[PDB]
Design an enzyme around this catalytic site. Structure first.
Site, PDB file in Angstrom:
ATOM      1  N   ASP A  62       0.825  -1.199   0.000  1.00  0.00           N
ATOM      2  CA  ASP A  62       0.000   0.000   0.000  1.00  0.00           C
ATOM      3  C   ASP A  62       0.866   1.259   0.000  1.00  0.00           C
ATOM      4  O   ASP A  62       1.795   1.374   0.799  1.00  0.00           O
ATOM      5  CB  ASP A  62      -0.927   0.007   1.215  1.00  0.00           C
ATOM      6  CG  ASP A  62      -2.191   0.813   1.012  1.00  0.00           C
ATOM      7  OD1 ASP A  62      -2.138   1.817   0.270  1.00  0.00           O
ATOM      8  OD2 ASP A  62      -3.234   0.447   1.603  1.00  0.00           O
ATOM      9  N   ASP A  68      -1.965  10.008   5.624  1.00  0.00           N
ATOM     10  CA  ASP A  68      -1.899   8.766   6.391  1.00  0.00           C
ATOM     11  C   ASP A  68      -0.928   8.934   7.563  1.00  0.00           C
ATOM     12  O   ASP A  68      -1.237   8.510   8.676  1.00  0.00           O
ATOM     13  CB  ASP A  68      -1.430   7.577   5.563  1.00  0.00           C
ATOM     14  CG  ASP A  68      -2.433   7.008   4.597  1.00  0.00           C
ATOM     15  OD1 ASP A  68      -3.631   6.940   4.929  1.00  0.00           O
ATOM     16  OD2 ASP A  68      -2.021   6.608   3.487  1.00  0.00           O
ATOM     17  N   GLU A  91      -3.384   0.240  10.764  1.00  0.00           N
ATOM     18  CA  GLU A  91      -3.099  -0.168   9.393  1.00  0.00           C
ATOM     19  C   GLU A  91      -1.676   0.210   8.997  1.00  0.00           C
ATOM     20  O   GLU A  91      -1.002  -0.505   8.259  1.00  0.00           O
ATOM     21  CB  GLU A  91      -4.100   0.480   8.421  1.00  0.00           C
ATOM     22  CG  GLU A  91      -3.718   0.266   6.964  1.00  0.00           C
ATOM     23  CD  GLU A  91      -4.460   1.086   5.936  1.00  0.00           C
ATOM     24  OE1 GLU A  91      -4.170   0.920   4.730  1.00  0.00           O
ATOM     25  OE2 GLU A  91      -5.313   1.931   6.240  1.00  0.00           O
ATOM     26  N   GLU A  92      -1.204   1.350   9.493  1.00  0.00           N
ATOM     27  CA  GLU A  92       0.078   1.907   9.101  1.00  0.00           C
ATOM     28  C   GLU A  92       1.279   1.334   9.833  1.00  0.00           C
ATOM     29  O   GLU A  92       2.419   1.666   9.483  1.00  0.00           O
ATOM     30  CB  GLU A  92       0.064   3.436   9.321  1.00  0.00           C
ATOM     31  CG  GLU A  92      -1.011   4.131   8.509  1.00  0.00           C
ATOM     32  CD  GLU A  92      -0.940   3.785   7.040  1.00  0.00           C
ATOM     33  OE1 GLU A  92       0.168   3.673   6.474  1.00  0.00           O
ATOM     34  OE2 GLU A  92      -2.022   3.619   6.440  1.00  0.00           O
ATOM     35  N   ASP A 112      -7.893   2.289  11.539  1.00  0.00           N
ATOM     36  CA  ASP A 112      -7.382   2.736  10.243  1.00  0.00           C
ATOM     37  C   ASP A 112      -7.328   4.255  10.311  1.00  0.00           C
ATOM     38  O   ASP A 112      -8.393   4.877  10.287  1.00  0.00           O
ATOM     39  CB  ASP A 112      -8.347   2.212   9.191  1.00  0.00           C
ATOM     40  CG  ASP A 112      -8.113   2.647   7.765  1.00  0.00           C
ATOM     41  OD1 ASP A 112      -8.965   2.255   6.932  1.00  0.00           O
ATOM     42  OD2 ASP A 112      -7.129   3.345   7.456  1.00  0.00           O
ATOM     43  N   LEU A 114      -6.641   6.677   8.390  1.00  0.00           N
ATOM     44  CA  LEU A 114      -7.319   7.384   7.286  1.00  0.00           C
ATOM     45  C   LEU A 114      -7.838   6.349   6.291  1.00  0.00           C
ATOM     46  O   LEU A 114      -7.010   5.657   5.704  1.00  0.00           O
ATOM     47  CB  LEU A 114      -6.390   8.388   6.603  1.00  0.00           C
ATOM     48  CG  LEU A 114      -7.058   9.412   5.672  1.00  0.00           C
ATOM     49  CD1 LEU A 114      -8.064  10.258   6.430  1.00  0.00           C
ATOM     50  CD2 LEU A 114      -6.024  10.303   5.018  1.00  0.00           C
ATOM     51  N   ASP A 115      -9.141   6.212   6.126  1.00  0.00           N
ATOM     52  CA  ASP A 115      -9.662   5.212   5.193  1.00  0.00           C
ATOM     53  C   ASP A 115     -10.164   5.931   3.939  1.00  0.00           C
ATOM     54  O   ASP A 115     -10.801   6.982   4.092  1.00  0.00           O
ATOM     55  CB  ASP A 115     -10.772   4.386   5.833  1.00  0.00           C
ATOM     56  CG  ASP A 115     -11.633   3.639   4.837  1.00  0.00           C
ATOM     57  OD1 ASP A 115     -11.156   2.621   4.309  1.00  0.00           O
ATOM     58  OD2 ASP A 115     -12.780   4.040   4.550  1.00  0.00           O
ATOM     59  N   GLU A 274     -10.910  -2.549   9.615  1.00  0.00           N
ATOM     60  CA  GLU A 274     -11.930  -2.122   8.656  1.00  0.00           C
ATOM     61  C   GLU A 274     -13.160  -2.994   8.813  1.00  0.00           C
ATOM     62  O   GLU A 274     -14.241  -2.493   9.130  1.00  0.00           O
ATOM     63  CB  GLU A 274     -11.398  -2.149   7.219  1.00  0.00           C
ATOM     64  CG  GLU A 274     -10.187  -1.254   7.009  1.00  0.00           C
ATOM     65  CD  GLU A 274      -9.572  -1.384   5.628  1.00  0.00           C
ATOM     66  OE1 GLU A 274      -9.340  -0.330   5.000  1.00  0.00           O
ATOM     67  OE2 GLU A 274      -9.297  -2.497   5.128  1.00  0.00           O
TER      68      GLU A 274
HETATM   69  O1  LIG Z   1     -10.476   0.406  -5.420  1.00  0.00           O
HETATM   70  P1  LIG Z   1     -11.255  -0.715  -4.763  1.00  0.00           P
HETATM   71  O2  LIG Z   1     -10.559  -2.044  -5.003  1.00  0.00           O
HETATM   72  O3  LIG Z   1     -12.716  -0.708  -5.034  1.00  0.00           O
HETATM   73  O4  LIG Z   1     -11.000  -0.489  -3.165  1.00  0.00           O
HETATM   74  C1  LIG Z   1     -11.867   0.415  -2.444  1.00  0.00           C
HETATM   75  C2  LIG Z   1     -11.732   0.041  -0.975  1.00  0.00           C
HETATM   76  O5  LIG Z   1     -10.326   0.225  -0.623  1.00  0.00           O
HETATM   77  C3  LIG Z   1     -10.207   0.993   0.575  1.00  0.00           C
HETATM   78  O6  LIG Z   1      -9.626   2.241   0.245  1.00  0.00           O
HETATM   79  C4  LIG Z   1      -9.262   0.285   1.536  1.00  0.00           C
HETATM   80  O7  LIG Z   1      -8.839   1.253   2.492  1.00  0.00           O
HETATM   81  C5  LIG Z   1     -11.607   1.117   1.152  1.00  0.00           C
HETATM   82  O8  LIG Z   1     -11.794   2.353   1.821  1.00  0.00           O
HETATM   83  C6  LIG Z   1     -12.512   0.957  -0.064  1.00  0.00           C
HETATM   84  O9  LIG Z   1     -13.798   0.453   0.247  1.00  0.00           O
HETATM   85 MG   LIG Z   2      -9.383   1.794   4.849  1.00  0.00          MG
HETATM   86 MG   LIG Z   3      -5.635   3.957   5.914  1.00  0.00          MG
HETATM   87 TL   LIG Z   4      -5.589   6.488   3.259  1.00  0.00          TL
HETATM   88 TL   LIG Z   5      -7.721  -2.318   2.919  1.00  0.00          TL
HETATM   89 TL   LIG Z   6      -2.516   3.009   4.122  1.00  0.00          TL
HETATM   90 TL   LIG Z   7      -5.623  -1.400   3.828  1.00  0.00          TL
END
Ligand SMILES: O=P(O)(O)OC[C@H]1O[C@](O)(CO)[C@@H](O)[C@@H]1O
Ligand SMILES: [Mg+2]
Ligand SMILES: [Mg+2]
Ligand SMILES: [Tl+]
Ligand SMILES: [Tl+]
Ligand SMILES: [Tl+]
Ligand SMILES: [Tl+]
Length: 331
Positions: A62, A68, A91-92, A112, A114-115, A274
């Site tokens: 990642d 982040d 996560e980090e 996480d 920052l998601d 998550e």
């Molecule tokens: O680009 P993709 O494969 O749909 O991934 C989106 C998913 O990945 C993430 O960024 C993982 O952190 C989620 O927030 C999100 O639901």
């Molecule tokens: Mg996330």
């Molecule tokens: Mg994150």
């Molecule tokens: Tl992020």
């Molecule tokens: Tl993820």
């Molecule tokens: Tl990350």
């Molecule tokens: Tl992740």
């Protein structure tokens, strides 16, 4: 007006009759501080030059963004300073973080910071996800304290940096939503005892993976688009940020899917920080959360960075998809 039902007040009164050391209030008050500081950076990230990468990669793979690093530092520092925690999983960070003896409290927090990483630079909704466990063991705190099943959660939720900033918090009796008032820097209760609809009319999945989907997901999606009973087809929504798609699922109903596929036996999303937090929110809201074959909250993790497939939302929609998995199930 002059009687603000803040997140603090709510969680203090909640933990009143139930007694308690009051470190959960301490924890959440602390978390709220990092969430405000993340919200303020996010809301002016372009001006403060906070877009772009940090120059590093996460565990399995990642690309780490600047926000982040910032959000990770803020959450860890405030949690440590809260005197409510002993083990932190982020996560980090490749390994669990053990809090120093002097600042140790009884909780284990997985988060996480920052998601929605792919949505940072285009200003789409992003968020923060957390799940909190009581340490059970009596031995020295360690990474294993974080390897509990989701059903052992005492609290979980997320902050959503969307059109407004919202803190969604789930605990044993239910789910409540608090909106950040940017004028006074307080989370105020705006939605009480949230419950998800039994059946929704939105499906949320990245159909870019159609080529890799298992036959059950493939069948389900075809059914949303061509209903056999002549009902109207479901609308599709996929913001691309788990916190945004899950929040919409909660307040509008429907289903969110990040399933296993031919290239990813365990899906993509991470179980500890998550999938478990969102599954817990959903279940406390009267919703369901499955891998397709088992409840996400019942999985016993063996890796803090473990992945899991997840399908969640309105019970009748999630059930419909489970029925398809069951129908397809083989030796
Ligand atoms: O680009 P993709 O494969 O749909 O991934 C989106 C998913 O990945 C993430 O960024 C993982 O952190 C989620 O927030 C999100 O639901
Ligand atoms: Mg996330
Ligand atoms: Mg994150
Ligand atoms: Tl992020
Ligand atoms: Tl993820
Ligand atoms: Tl990350
Ligand atoms: Tl992740």
């Amino acid at each position: 007006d002059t009687n603000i039902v803040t997140l603090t007040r709510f969680v203090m009164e909640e933990g009143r009759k139930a007694r308690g050391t009051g470190e959960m209030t301490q924890l959440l008050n602390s978390l709220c501080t990092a969430v405000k500081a993340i919200s303020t950076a996010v809301r002016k990230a372009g001006i403060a030059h906070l877009y772009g990468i940090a120059g590093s990669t996460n565990v399995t793979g990642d690309q780490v963004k600047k926000l982040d690093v910032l959000s990770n530092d803020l959450v860890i520092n405030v949690l440590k300073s809260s005197f409510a925690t002993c083990v932190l999983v982020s996560e980090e960070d490749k390994n669990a973080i053990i809090v120093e003896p002097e600042k140790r409290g009884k909780y284990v927090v997985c988060f996480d910071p920052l998601d929605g990483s792919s949505n940072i630079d285009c200003l789409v909704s992003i968020g923060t996800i957390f799940g909190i466990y009581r340490k059970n063991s009596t031995d020295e705190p360690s990474e294993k304290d974080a390897l509990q099943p989701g059903r052992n959660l005492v609290a979980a939720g997320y902050a959503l940096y969307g059109s407004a900033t919202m803190l969604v918090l789930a605990m044993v009796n239910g789910v409540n939503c608090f909106m950040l008032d940017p004028a006074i820097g307080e989370f105020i209760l705006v939605d009480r005892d949230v419950k998800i609809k039994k059946k929704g009319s939105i499906y949320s999945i990245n159909e870019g993976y159609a080529k890799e989907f298992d036959p059950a997901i493939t069948e389900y999606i075809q059914r949303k688009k061509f209903p056999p009973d002549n009902s109207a087809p479901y609308g599709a929504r996929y913001v691309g940020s788990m916190v945004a798609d899950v929040h919409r699922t909660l307040v509008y109903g429907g289903i969110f899917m990040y399933p296993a596929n031919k290239k990813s036996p365990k899906g993509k999303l991470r179980l500890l920080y998550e999938c478990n937090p969102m599954a817990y929110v959903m279940e406390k809201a009267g919703g369901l959360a499955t891998t397709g074959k088992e409840a996400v909250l019942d999985i016993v993790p063996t890796d803090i960075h473990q992945r899991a497939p997840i399908i969640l939302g309105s019970p009748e929609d999630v059930t419909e998809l489970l029925e398809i998995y069951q129908k397809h199930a083989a030796k």
